[PDB]
Amino acid sequence: GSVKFNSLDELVDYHRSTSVSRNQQIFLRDIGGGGHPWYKGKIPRAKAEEMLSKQRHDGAFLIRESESAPGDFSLSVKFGNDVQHFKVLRDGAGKYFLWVGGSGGSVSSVPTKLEVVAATPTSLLISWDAIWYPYYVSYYRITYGETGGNSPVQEFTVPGYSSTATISGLSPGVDYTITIYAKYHRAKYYSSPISINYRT
C-alpha cells in the first residue's frame, strides 16, 4: 500500500500536484534545453546535488539510476535548505511508489490508542495504535513506574513492527504510569508521548 503507479512518468505526474513530503507541501518541478525534462540516466549522487544546488525553487528534481542499488531508481529533490534523495519503491508486480501505507487521516506522530488489554496483579499486556505511517517507526520506547515518587522508571524498546508489549514484575496494589514514545526512522527526536495509568 498504497497509491501506486505503472511507470516513472506516472509517478512524476502525480507528484506535481501531491507532495513528495509527508509533512511539507513539496511538489516536483522541472530543473530550469531540448533534452528530457527530468531523467538523467546512470548519473552519480554527488553529481545530482551539483545539478540541484543551482536551483532556488522548491521541488526542483531529477530521477537518476541508483548508485547503491543497481537497477533501482533514485529521485533527487531540492527542499529549501538541502537536497533530499528518495528511493523509488517497487511492489510485487513491479509498480512504482514512494511511501508504504499512509497517514491515519492523522496529523501527528503520537500513538493514538494506548490501552491495557489484560492484567494480573504483577503483569500487563498493553496495546496501541500508530496510524501515522506505522511502517516508518523504527521502535517504540515503553516506560513504566509508580505514579508519584520515587525510584527509576523502568524502560525497554519494542521493534516498530510491533503493536503490543508485555510488562512484568510489577507489585500488586501499586498505581503505575505507563508511557510510550515512538521513534520514527529517522526523526532526530522521539515523538512526544502518550501515557496511561493503571493500578495493579
Partner: peptide
C-alpha cells in the same frame, strides 16, 4: 547511500 524515505 541514505534516503529520506527509507525503512527502519
Amino acid at each position: 547511500h541514505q534516503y529520506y524515505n527509507d525503512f527502519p
